[PDB]
């Protein structure tokens, strides 16, 4: 239960809705409510590249490092891809007839998932001219979050304001199963535990709770209570035995992933927390979070 948290870099900006770490460069991507996106080198504290993408909120953003791209989704309904070395706009298309909430990138195949207020998840194939390969229908409210299972990325999970998580197989039209979460104000976020020892998933809700699920038994393993307003996200750390959550209550919380009790609450001072990223290979155990008033990168 020993934590050593250091602030690596924090900067003020307009509301950060999406955030992501580059796997091999010391960079973080932020996507802003103002329509701007920024790539920061958090070691030198200098901007790599920034773009005014649109005038609408950009809620979702990811690196596709193996292609030197970022991919972003915005309230103008569009997915756009930029080469971060040249700034080339690679593609720009309407993906859904409504807001894009979340984007996920497959770890090996040229697949992107987008989740939308249009009640659907859509699968795009960038090696087939960004074709719409499949639409997953079944949710009954905004799809807030999509995530591939890192241990079996032929499957993915979607978290929805309809109070469910659905787990799907690529190429199949109905969910493999639906978790009725009992989080009655909806699911804002879903994440997979990344290691082989536990088949766990985690959900965050406006109902102030975080729940841990065993995806083989479909049972709720634990409920984490303590946040004082909407919980924006909750994730498992890739190297440390912790869960990190963030909330409109303005805090990040670090929870023990064995006992499911809170270990530390951080009052970041940037008002509401919206998004989170962890460094994929645990470099310096970095995490980053985006808030109303900027972002912070912390080493643990």
């Amino acid at each position: 239960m020993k934590l050593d948290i250091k602030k690596t870099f924090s900067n003020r900006s307009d509301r950060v809705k999406g955030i992501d770490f580059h796997p091999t460069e010391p960079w973080v991507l932020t996507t802003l409510y103002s329509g701007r996106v920024e790539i920061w080198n958090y070691e030198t504290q200098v901007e790599v590249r920034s773009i005014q993408v649109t005038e609408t909120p950009v809620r979702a953003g990811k690196f596709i490092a193996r292609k030197n791209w970022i991919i972003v989704g915005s309230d103008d309904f569009r997915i756009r891809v930029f080469n971060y070395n040249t700034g080339e706009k690679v593609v720009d298309f309407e993906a859904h007839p409504d807001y894009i909430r979340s984007i996920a990138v497959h770890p090996t195949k040229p697949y992107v998932l987008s989740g939308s207020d249009d009640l659907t998840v859509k699968l795009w194939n960038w090696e087939n001219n960004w074709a719409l390969e499949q639409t997953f229908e079944g949710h009954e409210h905004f799809v807030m979050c999509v995530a591939f299972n890192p241990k079996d990325p032929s499957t993915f999970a979607s978290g929805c304001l309809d109070r469910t998580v659905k787990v799907w197989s690529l190429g199949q039209s109905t969910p493999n199963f639906t978790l009725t979460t009992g989080q009655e104000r909806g699911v804002n976020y879903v994440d997979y535990y990344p290691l082989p020892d536990k088949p766990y998933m985690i959900t965050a809700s406006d109902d102030l709770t975080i729940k841990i699920w065993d995806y083989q038994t479909k049972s709720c393993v634990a409920t984490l209570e303590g946040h004082m307003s909407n919980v924006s996200f909750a994730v498992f750390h890739p190297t440390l035995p912790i869960i990190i959550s963030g909330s409109e209550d303005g805090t990040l919380k670090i929870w023990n992933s064995s006992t499911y009790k809170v270990e530390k609450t951080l009052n970041v001072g940037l008002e509401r927390s919206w998004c989170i990223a962890t460094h994929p290979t645990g470099r310096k155990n970095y995490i980053a979070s985006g808030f109303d008033n900027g972002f912070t990168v912390l080493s643990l």
């Binding site: 509301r15 409510y33 909430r101 905004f142 807030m144 304001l161 509401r272």
Partner: peptide, 5 residues
């Protein structure tokens, strides 16, 4: 109008 922020 849900989740506009």
């Amino acid at each position: 109008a849900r989740k506009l922020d």
